[PDB]
Structure formats: C-alpha cells, structure tokens
Design a protein around this ligand. Structure first.
Ligand SMILES: Nc1ncnc2c1ncn2[C@@H]1O[C@H](COP(=O)(O)OP(=O)(O)OP(O)(O)=S)[C@@H](O)[C@H]1O
Ligand SMILES: Nc1ncnc2c1ncn2[C@@H]1O[C@H](COP(=O)(O)OP(=O)(O)OP(O)(O)=S)[C@@H](O)[C@H]1O
Ligand SMILES: Nc1ncnc2c1ncn2[C@@H]1O[C@H](COP(=O)(O)OP(=O)(O)OP(O)(O)=S)[C@@H](O)[C@H]1O
Ligand SMILES: Nc1ncnc2c1ncn2[C@@H]1O[C@H](COP(=O)(O)OP(=O)(O)O)[C@@H](O)[C@H]1O
Ligand SMILES: [Mg+2]
Ligand SMILES: [Mg+2]
Ligand SMILES: [Mg+2]
Lengths: 330, 257, 341, 320, 391
DNA sequence: GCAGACACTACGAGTACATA
DNA sequence: TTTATGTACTCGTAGTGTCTGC
C-alpha cells in the first residue's frame, strides 16, 4: 500500500477491522464470537450474496484470534492463487500437518471463493479436512453452493450471510458521513437504500462518486437528485409518468413520452425495465394471464437488450408488451 | 552517486548465497541497513522460514545511509544472476525508495559493463522478530555429515524424527521400505577440528520433520562447513549455517502427533 | 486461364462499366488516399466486390497490385495441432480469408495482423468472406485496427451484414454494392461474347441468362461459358437454361417433399441432405434455396406458405446458433411435412 | 490462542461396530465378519455422512489390534494414488510378510475409491486376485459407478442406505445425555428435518445451536440454520397459484440471499427428482428450466428471469 | 487352509470337468493348445481340422467372472506347459515388453528343467491376462505375428478400437454367459459342503440379477452365510435388490432401452424414473445424442397422443434435437459450460425418444454422421487445395 | 584429474475427463 | 472419431548433477 489511507476507494478504506464493525448479520457475528470465546471453532462455511461481508468477517475473526500479523499465521488461498489438486496435496497438507511457527495456536485455513476449485481438489480437501481437524480449521467462503461438492457441504458448518437490511446500511452511512464531514438528505438516504439491492460496496461507491460530483465537497448536501444523476438510475417519478402514459395514453403520446424521458438525461432502457417490473409487482392483477404475458415478454426483452440491439425497437417492444398485457385483464 | 552501493568481491558469493535458498522460497524481502543486509522470507506453505543476513565485512565496499526495504523475487533474481561471468565483481545499486535495483556485472575490471535491472517487488510483510529463545538443545555437526544422513534417510521415509537424549543424537525415519536409525555419539578432535559433534543439554526433545523441507535445508550445506541445529518442544527448529561474516538460518516447523 | 470468369476482369475503375455512382464514390476515396479509412463492402455475391477492391488498390498505389504470390504460414494452436494456412500476399497489400477452421481463426488473425503491423505508408489487408468470422477474431480486430491504423488498413469484404458485430460496423466505413441490372448483365455478356468467338442467333439468350442468374454475374459468366462450350461455340435460341446440379438436387428434394409426405420420404430427404452437406455447401444457402423452392410450388396455400416461411426463419436462427446443420435441416423438413400434410 | 476443543463430530466418533446406527443388517453382517475374521473384499457405497468410512475404520481396528500401526495401509485422495508411483506401494504392502493372528489379514483401505483413474483399478484387479490370501481390500466410495466392473466382480457389495429418523434421534439423544444440554423435542425434530438423514450435518447443527443459544428449542434452531432450500423450491414449483409461487420465490429465496443460478439448479434437480406430476409435464418443465438456465449462464441473472420461468412453468402446469 | 481363504479361491476348479458352462470354448482351447506343436512342425502353412493350424495365438474375452483365467490356467497346467504370465500389475510398456518376455519368446523353462513323464513341461505358455489394461498393443500384435511358444491373451471387450489390430492375428475364442444348470449344481455342492441350506429356485434369480457372474455369486453366498445361513424364497427379492449390479450399457443397447415404449408408460415409470434415464444417458454421453437422432424416425411409435400422427411426433422430436444441438454448442465452446450436461441429456435423448418410443421398423443402425462428417472434412480440405492452387 | 557411469530433476507431448 | 478450454495423469527424453574409478 501507498500513502496509508485517504488514497484508497471508500470500498477498501472502510473495511471492518473488528467483528464489532460488521453490521447486518447480528446472529452470525454473535454466534462466531460465542464460538471463539468458548474456545470451539468448527469448520466454517460462509455463504451469501456479494458485498454482504463474508471475507471482512473472517479477516476480522483471524485478527481477533491471532495478533496484528494475522497473515503470518493464516494460509489464505484465493482464486488468484493456483489451487490445483497438487496444491492441496502439498501446501495444504504441509500447513495442516505441521505446528505453528510463530506462537502456540491452531492453524487456520481460509479458502476465499472456493467455489472455483475443481471437483478433484474438493475431493482431496475432504480427507485433508477430516484427517487433520485436531489442530487445523478450514473456512470456506463461497458465493455459489452448486459448485461445491455435497461431501464438502456436509463437512463444514453452514453460515448464511443475508443481504444487508435497512438499519445496517443506515448505520454504516452515518459512520461514513461522520468521518468524511459530509451531509446527506434523508430522501437521498432512502434512494441509496433502494439502489443498494442488498450490496454494501454499491453504497460506498455511490457515496464516493456523489462526493466527487459536488462542486463544493463541504456545505452542500447530497440530495436524491444528485444520487440520480451520479448513478444514472431512473427517478421514481419518471417511471411513474412513463407507466401512466403507457397505460392510459395512446401510441403517439406514450412513444413521445418514453422518448422524451429517455432523452431528458440519458436514461437507458435497462434499469427502467425492472423499475417498471417493480411498479407492476406493486399492482394487483385479477387475471394471471396478465402476469404471465408481462413476465415472459419483459424477460425476452431484457435478454435481447443484454445481447444488445436497436434501442428504439426495444422501447417500442416494451410499450407494446405492456399495453397488450393490460388488455387481456378486461 | 546512488544512495545504496554494495560491491561484492566476487559474483560467486552472491550466486551461491542466492542459490542456497532459491528453491525453497519464492518471495524475498531484503532490508538494507548500515549494520548490514538481511532477508526474512517465508515459504509458500508457511512452514519453512529463511532469515538471511550478510554482514558489512562480506562486501569489499558498502554504504547505505537510509534503511531500504527491497522486496524481491528469487526466480527472476536467480535468472539475472544466471547471466554474467562468475569471476566478475557485482555491485548492487539502488535509489531512494526505487522501483528497481541495478546489477553491475562489471566484467573483469574493465571493458564490458552490464546494467541488468530487476523491478522491485512490493512486499508489505514486515520482518518477523523470530531471532532465538531458550532452546532445549544445541548440537553442532559437520555439514557434509548432516547432508549425507538426510539424503540417506529421505529415501526410506517421508518424515525424519530427530531425538536428543543424554548426550546422543538419533535420527529415525520409519516408512514403507524400512526404518533408518542413524545415531551419532558426540566427540571432539584436535587433529581435525572441523569434524566435532558438539552438544548441549537442557531437556530431551523428540521432534519430527518433513523430508522435502530437510532436503531443502541440506541444499544449502555448500555455504557453510558447519551446521548448528537447535531444537525445542515449544519453538521451531533452527539451522544456523555460519557464513564468512553473517549467517543463514532455517526456521523449520515440526509436525505435531 | 481458359476460364472466361477470370479472363475478363476490369483492372481499373475506368474499366468498371457496372455502377457509375459506386465507381465515382470509389474514385472520390482514391482521390486523396492519405486518410483512407477502413472499408466494408457488402452486397449479393457475384456482384464484383473483389474487383472493386483490387481496382481501388491499384488506383491508390499504382499498377502491380495484380501480381500475386502464395506464402504458406505455419500456425500452432492449443496442444500441437497443425493448421498451416497459406496467405495470398503481394507487394503493397495482403489478402487473407478465414478458410481455416472457424473455432481457431482468432489466433490466425491475432499473430498475422500483429506480424504485418511491425512497420506507400500502409499495407491494405483484404479479408474475404468476413461474414464467416466467429465473433472472436472480430474482438481482436476491434483494437487491431483502432490501435495501429497509420501503418495498417483493412478492406473487410463480406456478402452479409448480420454476423458482423456492432463495433466492427462502427469503426469501418460502409460501402454498398448492388447487384447488376438485367440490362447491364446482358451488356456485359454481349461485350464478352463479341470479344470471344461465339455466334448468337438473338440477344434473347443473354436476357434469359440474366433472368436465370438472379443478379449474380459470376454464375452468369460461368453458365455462358458452359453453354458456349456445349453449344459448339454457337449459342442456340432453344438451348435449355442449364442449372447447377445443386439446384437440380434441391428441386428434386422439394418435389419429393411436396408429393410424398411420409416418414420414408423423410428418410430419403435425410440421405439427400447428407450427400449435399458432403458436397461442400453452407447450411444458410441450402436452407434458403429449399425454402424459396418450396414457396414457388403452385399447389401450396397462403397459410402453408406463411407457416413454411415462419418455421424457415426459426430454423435459420437455429442454424446461426448450432454446430451440426443436419439436425436443424431435418427438423425444418419435418415441420414442412407436418404443415403440408 | 488456546488449544481448540475437539468438535462433537470427531469427539463422539464411534470406535466399535455397536455404536453405528442405521442399516442394522449391514452392521450385523460386519459384526459377524469381525468375530469370524474371514473378511472378503468389499465396496461400500451410499450418500455422504451416513457412516461409510467410520465402519471401515472400526472393522479394521476390531479385526487386528496392536498390529494396526503397520498391518493396515490407508490411502485417500490426499495421497497421490496414481497408476505408477502407487502400484509399487500396494504391491510391496501385499507382498510384505507380517505375522497376524490365524484368522486376520492385512487391510488396504482405499478410502474415497471413486476418484481413482482407470489404469489404477486395472492394476488393482490382478493385485487383488493374486494376493487374496494375505491382503484384503476395502473400497469406500460415495458413488459406485466410477468403479469398473472387473472390480465389482470380485468385491462384496455393501450398500448403505440413508439413516431413518429414529436412529438419528436415538444417537442424538445419546449425545445429549453424554453432554447434558437442555433440549426440547420440537428442537430435536427440527434438527432431524434440517439434517435430511445426513448425520454429520445433524451433529454440526446441534453444535451450532448449543454454542449459539444454549437451548436447542425449535426457534433457535431455525434462527441459526435455515430450512433446506430444495424443500422450498419443491413447494414453490408445486403451487397452483402463480402469485403464490412468485411470493414464495421472492420472500424465501430472493430476500434470503440465494443466487439465481442456485435456484435454477435446485429447480432442475427437484423437477428431475419429482414424481407426482405427469412424466411429459416434467419433460416440458425441464426444458423450460433449462432454457432459463442457459439465459442465466449467458450472463443475465435477474429476478425477472426467475419470474418468467415460474410463469411458464405455471403455463405448462395449468394446461394453458 | 480352511476358514481363512476366500470362497472364490478354495472352490476354484481343479480340472476341466469342474467348469460351469462354456464347455465348447474350453474344449476348443484344449484342442488348440493340444495341437500347437503339430502346427509348428507344419510351419503354419495350412489350417487343421478346426482351423488351429494357421493361428499360433489365441485370445479370450467375455463378461467378468465367467472363467477365462481359470480355463487358461487349467489348460496350461494339464498339458504340463510352464505358465509365464504378464499382468496389469506389472509394466507392459513397449521398451519393457521388448526388455521382458521378448527373449522368452523362444527360450526354455529353467524351472521346467528343475521340476522334471512330463514330456512337454519344458516350454513357455505366455499369458497376457487383462489386455485391456494398457504402443503396447502394437508390440503384442508383432509378438503374435512371430512367436515360437504358445501364446494366448485375455481381455474383456474385443469391440474396443485399441484391440482392433488383433482382428486377424489371433484365434478368437468367445466365452458367454453360462447356463444356470451347471452353476446350480456347483452351488448345491458348495451349500452341502459349507453347512448352509440353499433353495433351488433361488439360484436362477441370483444368476439373473448378478448377470452371469459366478465369482460374484460365490461372494454373495459367502456374505449371506456370514450371518444368515438359511437362504429361502422370502428374502430373495431383498437380496437381489441389495446386490443388484449397475452395469454400464453399450450404445446400441442404450438406444434400444431409450426407444422402448414401456419405460414411458404410466406403469413402467414407477421403477424406471427419468433420473434412471439421465443416468443411462450419462454412461456414453458422446454416442447417445448421435444414436438417438439416427433411429428416432425408423420405429413404430407406441406413445402417440390421441389425435397425433407419427409425423407430428417426429417433427416435435426433431425440434428438441435441434435445441440440444444449440445446448451442446454452448457446452463445447470457449465458455465451456459443463454444468449444462443434464439439460443436454434431456433435450437430446430423453424428450425426443419420449415421443417416438416403440419397436424398431428395421434395426438399430450405427451412427453415420461421424463417417459423413469425416468424408466432408476431407472433401473440404481437397476443395481448399484446388481453390488455393487455381487462385 | 579427466573420462565414463550413474540416477536424479526438469521438460514436453500425448491421452481422457468434464454432475453428482 | 469432429467437438474446444482447462485440468490432471503418464510417459519419454534430454541433459545436469554428483559419485567411482585409473
Ligand atoms: N456488514 C458490513 N458492515 C460493514 N461494512 C460491510 C459489511 N459488509 C460489507 N461491507 C463493506 O463491503 C466491503 C467489501 O465487502 P467484503 O466483505 O470485503 O467482500 P464480500 O462481502 O465477502 O463479497 P465477496 O463475496 O467477497 S465479492 C468491505 O470492505 C466493507 O467496507
Ligand atoms: N450410523 C452412525 N452412527 C453414529 N455416528 C455416525 C453414523 N453415521 C455417521 N456418523 C457420524 O458421522 C461422522 C463421520 O461420518 P463419516 O462416516 O466419516 O461420513 P462418511 O460416511 O464417510 O460420508 P463421506 O462420503 O465420507 S462425506 C462422525 O461424527 C460419526 O459419529
Ligand atoms: N465356470 C466356472 N465354474 C466354476 N467356478 C468358476 C467359473 N468361472 C469362474 N469361477 C470362479 O471364479 C473365480 C475367478 O474366475 P476367473 O476366471 O478368474 O474370472 P475371469 O474370467 O478372469 O474374469 P476377469 O479376469 O475378472 S474380467 C474362480 O477361481 C472360480 O472360483
Ligand atoms: N464492370 C464489370 N464489367 C465486366 N465484368 C465484371 C465487372 N465487375 C465485375 N465483373 C465480373 O465479376 C467477376 C468477379 O466477381 P467477384 O468479385 O468474384 O464477386 P464476389 O466478390 O461476389 O465473389 C469477374 O469474372 C468479372 O468478369
Ligand atoms: Mg471475499
Ligand atoms: Mg468418509
Ligand atoms: Mg482374468
């Protein structure tokens, strides 16, 4: 690292250095603290969506158990490091079999993003874990469970990291604003909550980019308007107006309204499709055929947009799909 | 001109020192100071720890006012040392917190001059203060004898168990082919002072070690005529190879159970 | 050579008596070649795109582009498979095609374009049949022409636009090559025959060749040469319009599909398809010919025609995303049999 | 850093054949082999965590005693079991002359035998056939399909089945009485339901609940460990109302932090393992789930894709 | 000794009159090895009565555990020929094979000198048991061309292409599944010798489920007699289900089982669920998609829905075959998504064969897309050659 | 000591698997 | 038998090194 902090992104600057600094997962953190205070630590398996605080939790845990130099006492392997079955047969076996080199303690092995390991590597790791579990504990961080061997799943204690609720994001945002001498309006905070979609890195990145957006970093408050231009996400009022124009107004008015909304501040049809999806999910529909047609046609449109294409034709397709789906209901 | 200057008497010394622990370690963290140059490096399995230290007396000329952290890579370092005549005089050159160092492979003493440079590597791992402690035993046997014993026993088992009890060194390695039980009785000789099995005793020790790591240790036996092994039940094994002005330890971690 | 298709080819833009507007546009580009961008000529095959490319090349530098040589280049891939693909090189330009196996033409593109970019300031790189690229070599090309441009230039020739990805369309200038008019086909054939020694009863034969060729001048010249050889160098007004044996096989398959709509006839259809795929034919053109020959049968209905064309579109989409074309073609024939029955 | 207490999975591992619960006939046959001594070559197969390798180790311990240090050669995936460097090891071990009791033989525990290559098993064929008097083998593989048919032609097939709820409950109650932790029958049945006949999972969940809340009551159990998502997926796919299926999807998987690809794979597995609905209906369900799977793997992973998958599954299920 | 030896070892046949079934094959082997020396004196320029005069080498194949090794051993020992066996436990590499029994191809038995009237106890009979456990096959074939000693080979599957050079260099002797009567008699003798009762109707089901594997039958008898010496007709189904052998299936038989109309019936799906169909596909995942496509349109369909003709079912199966083509293309590409194999299994084998299931119109034909594709690839190469030459 | 002999590590080409 | 990367295994070869010897 260079120049200590203040030269890092807010994602890597506000990384929790203690188990007390991890928010949201209250149950998991309390259970882990009880585990390490009572002296028992089984093979841990942390599962959850990206950005929920798995590797931060395990790094804080290893820092708490050991001294400051946790990296000198932990064999932390990642997908960047080669993890073939020869690596399991040699490096993992030697680290598990031998005694600690710096003090008296149990060896800890952290396998971040272990879902990328091959099937044979996991098969070897099975017996490696089970044989030398007396003085060596394995931790597996996996975003995807279908890539893990069921034998490996049946061996490690499963901990699920839920997406961060509202209160955890609010507390972290309050801490960040206190540190950074920054002010932010509550409606902007709610917009950040809706924009996060359970991710914390998204929140930190949007805060950093919005502080960069302001001409004067101090004094000026971050409103939801600044959030919406900086992220580029559609405003809820724009989505409501577009949906109303589509539902009631005819083709000329609806097409002109959608084009004007998109060209006002450079909206994309994506993020607008699932904004409309959220708004329509907030409706009650008497006929299931409306739901079926909406879901199928909008999924096809989103797939086509993901593959890329002509935006005008896709917008016309969106309008046609919605208007054809809300006429079968009556 | 440059802040850090270290002109070796010969490139052979540095080549031998690097090749001593090149195989067992990938990343090396040199720390140049006015007292000398040290290098604390850890194996990938984090079992075998190497602590190089070269005194100021092994350099024909040496000067380094500001402490420098030279994190490097032994593969590319050995590749750089591979090219260049061994009789040539190497001169390590570095700047004030640089991105690289300069290897003066000055051929003979005139004419050809080389300027091989290796980009410096950002190793943020601080040096580990594992110097020594109250060791239970302190033996000292010739490097050739220890290397021969380790090479003979590695073919019989995957683990060599070193036992010291009542002024006696005993190596045992039980495996599939057989079980070696090479034993050594301490002695001293005035006729040939180099071969002398020195020993000290506080408490008996029964520590087992891997075979490949011990082979990695004995690969460095060419540097020193004598090797000093110190063991303890609550300390990693120490293998102090004595150099012309410094030393080269090997902190090996024993197996448990 | 003795073939008339490669004996009379216009070397310069002055001899391009095909399209006045396209020749004028190419001459506009050749007026100041110091800043000529990358081109991409598209249109029906047989129009003469390569002729325009070579004419523009010799208008940029000078005479001598038309002298060519063969230089086989050894290329190594994953494992140790050898797929040595020759390049038809020349002074002042370089001609390449993705005739190599499609799954690993990306390496051919990568190292060959990197080798030619090691240095009359630029060497044009013509890529025939660019629509056959597999969206992986095009990814390399995206930065290949963008990074090094003052030293290398591309004239990317392809007969279709759909497989070419959006960035390649974006960074390349688009030039359109319409097919010749029937009057122009007849004029070109008349000039060829009066430079040749074939006797014509009436120019109606040239018009019939123009109508049968369907805007394809290359097959028009080939058919004229074949007829002249078969008619003892004296064309007859009653000479039947000879078709390629491939067209005959397609039409016989269409007749068998139309008349008999049983499973056994589908078995002989599968056998004929196996033979045709063994006869070096792309899947897109054979499905297109089968579809358009099916729609030309007069015993069909408009509903059957609509169903056939819709399933033809579906199975052509399947061809664009499939490996073994025989399954898709057999499925299309099965659906056609189901609809007609 | 204090020395860790051994986990209850390994602390209470059985050491005698009597403590293994489930598959009473197989355990009794193993006991009769143990006192008889005439151990044949056997292959042990079953789902993970039901007591395969522990029975092998217990039988090896019981048949031969103080000779356990050198009279048994144990191999596993961590050892580089290849055709060349390892054929010599078993060849020497079988050719090794060690004096046993009259009715006992050397044991070669080729643990996790489904991961070996074909050539290793081809050599093991004649290795087993030659020295059948001196050494005996013991394969312990999760899947018996990888083992070639010549190896199956000279082995005793011992198929373990998933543990019944009564046996898991019995051994669990034994563990509670040895550990003296306050328990409620509702919590125990919650542990049984969560384990799905996987014994090690039951012990691990018991550990987590005991050391997380002290009491193993059902609320604490469901707080610590979640219900198995295959059951939730099966409930979602079998619902009759599309709104109900969408609500189950969202609330129980999307708001609980489950990846879309995990939901799709679990839906495919549930559909292929489901039997209530008609075979053809399962075929179109599998086809649609696979189309959504291709969409997910190609890059677009969204709640909308899963919602469309459920909508089309309801289209096929409701018969238009 | 007794009680400390495997049942499949102590009850091994002692003479050629103790082999269960395969009397014709053992008789043929005995005739061939009893007349090899006459063929040697004839210099292999003509055949004999049964044709043994042209082939100095023979090879034995069959299902496992039927008696190939025992027949070879007894035939070699009865005439006194000294056995010299090579096995998969030892190296059969080309260099070591040339450094192994290559000199022994025309030497003499020194132990035959020391052992011993035994007139023909002074020669090598060479035994490559487990030939399939392999340029070893080329060296073995070249040995078969030139050998001065009796030579036989034991393998399991002739149809593998790696024993294709053995097509006409050996006297093939085929061993089949033995008839249940001899095995019944042998198990009666074994049961009355080992104190446990056996019920005659049980042997038929044991052979049926074990698929004619006598060694596994003996192992089953031993294991059952460990704790329950009495074998009756009550637990016969329990034992058969517990010891059922999940043998792999050949591509033609895979196509036959996939196209059988019973498995897709309502009653037939209780035991043979679609999971079993996926497992059956996964045995040979490279030939099943090709095998299904080439004979899904040459059957009488027996699972036609009401109001649906055979052509409609053919088209609806072809649609999913085309979908499976795209799935395979995504699987075998740069992305390399091998988690998509179960989907390809359904879309390429199960669903297309779930609509055209029934008895064969003709018979299952080998895949022709491989040969057609190879010929097309060569024709493409020759087309490229002439295209570049004339350019 | 130079020469041969020796067995070792290192390297390269080929084959086969890829969901339970 | 084509497939089209990445992984793992296996073998074979070429040198490279120290060890015996005259
Ligand atoms: N519960 C939390 N409390 C505070 N900060 C958090 C929390 N969860 C995530 N973060 C922040 O998110 C940043 C990156 O997330 P990490 O926890 O390091 O990675 P991760 O959450 O495990 O996601 P993956 O699966 O590794 S990509 C951290 O540096 C923290 O600043
Ligand atoms: N029948 C049983 N009785 C008692 N404990 C059991 C039983 N089955 C499993 N266990 C426990 O399961 C743990 C180890 O089970 P193992 O036998 O090692 O799993 P496994 O059968 O080998 O499955 P895999 O394929 O190796 S993951 C120990 O804590 C045992 O106490
Ligand atoms: N026909 C038979 N009659 C009696 N016992 C038999 C018969 N065939 C096999 N056995 C028994 O099975 C044992 C082994 O038979 P083998 O001939 O070795 O099997 P195999 O033919 O070699 O098949 P492989 O080599 O495993 S593929 C013999 O020792 C007998 O106990
Ligand atoms: N202006 C023209 N006058 C006469 N013939 C022409 C003209 N332009 C093209 N051709 C004919 O077109 C043929 C070459 O076509 P080609 O460039 O191969 O088509 P494609 O590029 O579609 O394969 C030549 O034989 C040539 O006679
Ligand atoms: Mg992480
Ligand atoms: Mg196990
Ligand atoms: Mg045999």
């Amino acid at each position: 690292e260079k120049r200590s902090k203040e030269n890092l992104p807010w994602v890597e600057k506000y990384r929790p250095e203690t188990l007390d600094e991890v928010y949201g997962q209250n149950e998991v953190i309390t259970t882990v603290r009880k585990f390490v205070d009572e002296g028992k630590l089984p093979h841990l398996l942390f599962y959850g969506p990206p950005g929920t605080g798995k590797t931060s939790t395990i790094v804080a845990l290893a820092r708490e158990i050991y001294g400051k130099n946790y990296s000198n006492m932990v064999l932390e392997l990642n997908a960047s490091d080669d993890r073939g079955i020869d690596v399991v047969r040699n490096q993992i076996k030697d680290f598990a079999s031998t005694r600690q080199i710096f003090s008296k303690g149990f060896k800890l092995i952290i396998l971040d993003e272990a879902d990328a390991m091959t099937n044979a590597a996991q098969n070897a790791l099975r017996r490696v874990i089970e044989r030398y579990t007396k003085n060596t504990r394995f931790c597996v961080l996996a975003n995807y469970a279908h890539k893990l061997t069921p034998a490996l799943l049946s061996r490690c204690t499963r901990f699920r990291f839920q997406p961060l609720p509202q209160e955890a994001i609010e507390r972290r945002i309050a801490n960040v604003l206190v540190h950074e001498k920054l002010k932010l309006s509550p409606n902007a905070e709610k917009a950040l909550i809706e924009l996060s979609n359970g991710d914390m890195r998204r929140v930190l990145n949007v805060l950093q980019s919005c502080k960069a957006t302001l001409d004067n970093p101090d004094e000026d408050e971050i409103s939801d308007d600044v959030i919406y231009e900086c992220c580029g996400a559609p405003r809820p009022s724009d989505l409501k107006a577009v949906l109303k124009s589509i539902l009631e107004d005819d083709w000329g008015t609806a097409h002109y309204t959608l084009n004007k909304v998109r060209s006002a501040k450079g909206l994309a049809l994506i993020d607008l499709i699932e904004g409309i999806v959220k708004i329509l999910e907030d409706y009650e529909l008497q006929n299931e055929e409306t739901r079926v047609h909406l879901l199928t046609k909008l999924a096809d449109i989103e797939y086509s947009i993901s593959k890329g294409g002509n935006d005008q034709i896709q917008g016309s397709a969106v309008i046609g799909a919605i208007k054809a789906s809300f006429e079968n209901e009556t | 001109a440059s802040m850090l200057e270290a002109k070796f008497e010969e490139a052979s010394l540095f080549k031998r020192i690097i090749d001593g622990f090149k195989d067992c370690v990938q990343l090396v963290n040199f720390q140049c100071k006015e007292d000398g140059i040290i290098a604390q490096a850890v194996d990938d399995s984090r079992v075998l720890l190497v602590s190089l230290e070269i005194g100021v007396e092994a350099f024909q000329e040496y000067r380094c006012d500001h402490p420098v952290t030279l994190g490097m890579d032994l593969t590319s370092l050995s590749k750089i040392l591979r090219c260049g005549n061994n009789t040539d005089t190497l001169t390590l050159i570095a700047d004030n917190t640089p991105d690289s160092i300069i290897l003066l492979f000055e051929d003979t003493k005139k004419d050809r001059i080389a300027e091989y440079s290796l980009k410096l590597m950002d190793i943020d791992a601080d040096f580990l203060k594992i110097e020594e402690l109250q060791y239970d035993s302190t033996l000292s046997l010739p490097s050739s004898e220890f290397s021969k014993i380790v090479r003979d026993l590695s073919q019989l088992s995957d683990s060599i168990n070193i036992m010291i009890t009542k002024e006696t060194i005993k190596f045992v390695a039980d495996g599939d082919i057989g079980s070696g039980s090479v034993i050594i009785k301490p002695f001293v000789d005035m006729e040939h002072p180099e071969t002398s099995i020195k020993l000290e005793m506080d408490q008996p020790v029964d520590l087992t070690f891997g075979a490949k790591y011990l082979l990695d240790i004995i690969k460095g036996s060419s540097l020193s005529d004598r090797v000093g092994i110190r063991l303890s039940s609550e300390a990693p094994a120490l293998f102090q190879f004595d150099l012309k002005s410094g030393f080269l330890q090997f902190f090996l971690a024993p197996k448990f159970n | 050579m003795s073939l008339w298709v490669d004996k009379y080819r216009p070397k310069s833009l002055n001899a391009l008596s095909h399209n006045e507007e396209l020749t004028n546009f190419l001459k506009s580009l050749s007026d100041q070649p110091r800043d000529l961008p990358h081109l991409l000529l598209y249109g029906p095959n047989g129009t003469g795109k390569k002729t325009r490319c070579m004419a523009l090349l010799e208008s940029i530098f000078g005479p001598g582009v038309y002298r060519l040589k063969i230089d086989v280049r050894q290329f190594v891939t994953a494992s140790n498979r050898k797929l040595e693909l020759n390049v038809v090189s020349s002074p002042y330009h370089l001609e390449i095609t993705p005739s190599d196996m499609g799954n690993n033409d990306r390496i051919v593109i990568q190292e060959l374009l990197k080798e030619v970019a090691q240095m009359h300031r630029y060497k044009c790189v013509i890529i025939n049949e660019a629509n056959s690229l597999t969206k992986d070599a095009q990814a390399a090309l995206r930065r290949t022409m963008e990074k090094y441009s003052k030293n290398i230039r591309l004239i990317m020739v392809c007969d279709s636009m759909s497989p070419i990805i959006a960035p390649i369309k974006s960074r390349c200038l688009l030039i359109r090559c319409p097919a010749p008019s029937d009057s122009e086909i007849s004029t070109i054939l008349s000039d060829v025959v009066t430079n040749e020694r074939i006797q014509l009863e009436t120019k109606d034969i040239l018009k019939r060749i123009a109508q049968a060729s369907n805007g394809n001048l290359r097959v028009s010249l080939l058919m004229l040469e074949s007829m002249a050889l078969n008619n003892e160098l004296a064309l007859k007004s009653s000479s039947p319009i000879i078709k390629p044996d491939w067209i005959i096989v397609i039409h016989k398959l269409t007749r068998k599909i139309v008349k008999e709509r049983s499973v056994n006839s589908l078995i002989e259809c599968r056998a004929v398809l196996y033979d045709l795929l063994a006869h070096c034919i792309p899947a897109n053109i054979i499905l297109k010919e089968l579809t358009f020959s099916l729609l030309d049968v007069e015993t069909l209905n408009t509903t059957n025609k609509s169903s056939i064309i819709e399933y033809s579109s579906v199975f052509d989409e399947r061809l664009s995303l499939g490996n073994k074309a025989i399954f898709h073609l057999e499925g299309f024939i099965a659906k056609v049999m189901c609809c007609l029955d | 850093t204090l020395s860790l207490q051994l986990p209850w999975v390994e602390k209470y591992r059985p050491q005698v054949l009597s403590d293994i619960v489930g598959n009473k006939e197989t355990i009794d046959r193993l006991q009769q082999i143990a006192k008889d001594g005439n151990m044949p070559h056997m292959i042990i197969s079953g789902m993970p965590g039901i007591g395969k390798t522990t029975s092998v180790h217990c039988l090896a311990h019981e048949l031969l005693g103080r000779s356990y240090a050198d009279g048994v050669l144990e191999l596993n995936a961590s050892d580089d079991r290849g055709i060349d460097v390892v054929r010599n090891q078993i060849k020497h071990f079988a050719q090794k002359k060690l004096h046993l009791p009259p009715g006992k033989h050397k044991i070669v525990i080729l643990d996790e035998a489904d991961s070996m290559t074909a050539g290793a098993q081809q050599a093991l064929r004649r290795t087993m056939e030659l020295y059948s008097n001196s050494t005996r083998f013991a394969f312990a593989c999760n899947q018996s399909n990888k083992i070639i048919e010549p190896l199956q032609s000279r082995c005793a097939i011992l198929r373990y089945s998933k543990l019944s709820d009564e046996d898991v409950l019995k051994r669990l109650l034994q563990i509670i009485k040895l550990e003296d932790v306050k328990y409620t029958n509702d919590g125990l049945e919650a542990i049984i339901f969560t384990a799905e006949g996987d014994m090690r999972q039951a012990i691990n969940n018991l550990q987590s609940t005991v050391a997380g809340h002290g009491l193993v009551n059902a609320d604490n159990v469901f707080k610590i460990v979640d219900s198995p998502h295959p059951l939730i997926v099966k409930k979602m796919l079998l619902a009759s109302n599309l709104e109900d299926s969408i609500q189950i999807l969202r609330t129980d998987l999307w708001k609980k932090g489950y990846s879309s690809i995990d939901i799709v794979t679990t839906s495919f597995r549930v559909t292929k393992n489901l039997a209530q609905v008609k075979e053809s209906v399962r075929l179109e369900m599998i086809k649609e789930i696979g189309l959504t799977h291709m969409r997910i793997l190609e890059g677009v992973g969204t709640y909308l894709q899963l919602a469309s998958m459920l909508a089309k599954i309801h289209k096929l299920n409701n018969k238009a | 000794r007794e009680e400390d030896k495997l049942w499949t070892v102590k009850y091994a046949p002692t003479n050629l009159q103790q082999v269960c079934g395969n009397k014709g094959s053992v008789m043929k082997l005995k005739n061939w090895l009893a007349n090899w020396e006459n063929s040697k004196k004839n210099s292999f320029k003509h055949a004999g009565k049964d044709g043994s005069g042209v082939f100095r080498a023979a090879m034995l194949y069959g299902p496992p555990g039927i008696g190939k090794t025992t027949a070879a051993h007894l035939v070699a020992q009865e005439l006194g020929y000294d056995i010299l066996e090579q096995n998969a436990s030892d190296v059969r590499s080309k260099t070591l094979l040339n450094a192994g029994v290559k000199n022994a191809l025309d030497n003499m038995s020194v132990v035959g000198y020391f052992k011993h009237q035994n007139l023909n106890g002074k020669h090598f009979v060479i035994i490559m048991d487990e030939v399939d456990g392999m340029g070893g096959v080329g060296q073995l074939a070249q040995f078969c061309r030139k050998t001065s000693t009796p030579l036989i080979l034991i393998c399991n599957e002739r149809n593998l292409p790696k024993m294709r050079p053995f097509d006409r260099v050996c006297l093939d002797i085929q061993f089949r599944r033995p008839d249940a009567n001899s095995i019944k008699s042998r198990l009666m003798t074994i049961a009355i010798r080992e104190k446990f009762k056996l019920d005659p109707n049980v042997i038929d089901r044991l052979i049926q489920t074990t698929r004619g594997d006598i060694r596994q039958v003996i192992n089953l008898l031993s294991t059952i007699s460990t704790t329950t010496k009495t074998i009756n007709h009550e637990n016969i189904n329990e034992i058969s289900k517990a010891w059922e052998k999940n043998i792999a299936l050949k591509p033609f038989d895979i196509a036959h089982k996939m196209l059988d109309g019973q498995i897709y019936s309502d009653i037939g799906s209780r035991n043979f669920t679609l999971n079993d169909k996926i497992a059956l596909y996964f045995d040979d995942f490279d030939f099943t998609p090709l095998m299904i496509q080439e004979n899904y349109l040459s059957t009488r369909p027996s699972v036609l829905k009401p109001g649906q003709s055979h052509l409609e079912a053919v088209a609806e199966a072809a649609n999913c075959i085309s979908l499976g083509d795209i799935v395979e293309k995504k699987i075998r590409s740069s992305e390399q998504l091998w988690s998509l194999l179960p989907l390809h299994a359904v879309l390429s084998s199960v669903y297309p064969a779930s609509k055209v299931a029934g008895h064969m119109a003709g018979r299952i034909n080998f895949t022709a897309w491989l040969g057609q594709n190879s010929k097309s690839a060569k024709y493409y190469r020759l087309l490229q050659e002439i295209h570049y030459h004339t350019r």
